[model samples]
Target: TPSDKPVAHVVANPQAEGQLQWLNRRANALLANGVELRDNQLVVPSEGLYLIYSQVLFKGQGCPSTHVLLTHTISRIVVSYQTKVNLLSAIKSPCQRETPEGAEAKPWYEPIYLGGVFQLEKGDRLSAEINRPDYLLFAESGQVYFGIIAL
Candidate 1:
């Protein structure tokens, strides 16, 4: 049914609290097709299959730095569909890169993206989370993005 079409896209707030926490970003800008934004979370508008995605960028400044690690994941909670369920659970291992031993404060950026399709019911909620807060950086351009689309 055309009413089953639901989609939404959101971006992370530069000041969002990271560190093993969910990124509560904007959910109203590109939201439509029955999808809704509520309390910084994506509210599933109908029962159907959906493709969900999330991505975050990490940056490094100042030389002589410790090894950096970044992890990201997208999660969902279904209120029904037989029983309360969790879906689209994804976890990316922390990223580590070696800088030159004697290099100056070289700047670096690392990004992690996660997406997958899942069976979801109406009223399901979705969000993204990261392991490190300090690694997330704000740039003139956006570095964090999340969204969902029914298929």
Candidate 2:
């Protein structure tokens, strides 16, 4: 059973930033079964096949006349002591705004969602990354979320 596997966790952003840094679930960190959270990384318990996901909200006022490129990425790392291996990654790029003339530049909102499955081993770590840190808007109301589920 999926619910009985002790391998699912959901985290919501309470304090996400645009420093081009790894995302964290400081507000609502859900660790079901044996999943663990250390710093901003999700630590796998006993690995198998797992699905990881992330949702990023990019918003700004008064759109620019030029284009803005934003990238969202979810990555997994397998670590043993001081050594580590990057296992899987999923990235999405959504171009924003090529403003038009004759009107006010309206506010813009974009949401990027990424999810995928991969083979993982115990002690693997997972995290979400954003390229444009200053363009990201974190919500206290769980508007941005990340999670993983074991299959």
Candidate 3:
């Protein structure tokens, strides 16, 4: 805690196209002095080894499990290749079997989480995306957040 290192933690401020804007300006969000949040992306600041993580909570009310789905992804955007390679991706959906046979409709909640350690280099970018942004909880910062820790 005494030493300064690059670090950032941001909460969800999802966009219309199922991409995330961490809302770094909020009180609950954070960015180290050297780190940066630009165009809704977390910019790596002189990275070595780092841990990247994110959590997204989705809500689809009164729907069939087949129709209620969640897709959360954390991606890496290398400056040389701007294709934005997806590093971690997840898919989740409500369980139809959990409902009574007669009940076809029910409220759904699906939370997806992902993290990984990578030998990141400087200027590499990190971003979050979801397939069902319309159903996102958009709750308190802690409920849906993205973070990075430089090791």
Number of the top-ranking candidate, with TM-score as the measure: 3
lDDT of 2 by residue, 1-151 (tens): 2376645445444454445333434455557678877776788888688887777777665666454566666776666543444443434434355453567555467788878877777878776766666666654446566678778
Model 3 local distance difference test score: 0.74
Candidate 2's TM-score: 0.71
What is the alpha-carbon lDDT for the whole of candidate 1? 0.64
Candidate with maximal lDDT? 3
User: Local distance difference test, per candidate?
Assistant: 0.64, 0.63, 0.74
Per model, state how many residue pairs clash: 1, 1, 0
- RMSD list, candidates in order: 4.6, 4.1, 3.0
How would you encode candidate 1's per-residue C-alpha lDDT over 11-105 as one tens digit per residue? 66665554422233344436767777676668787888888887777775643345434556567756664443444443433324444466645
Q: Itemize residue pairs with steric clashes in candidate 2.
A: 18-133
Residue range with the least summed lDDT across 10 consecutive positions in model 2: 86-95
Q: What is the lDDT of residue 77 in candidate 3?
A: 89
Instruction: Give stretches of model 3 more than 4 Å off.
Output: 14-19, 65-68, 97-105
Distance from true location, Cα of 5 in model 1, Å: 2.1
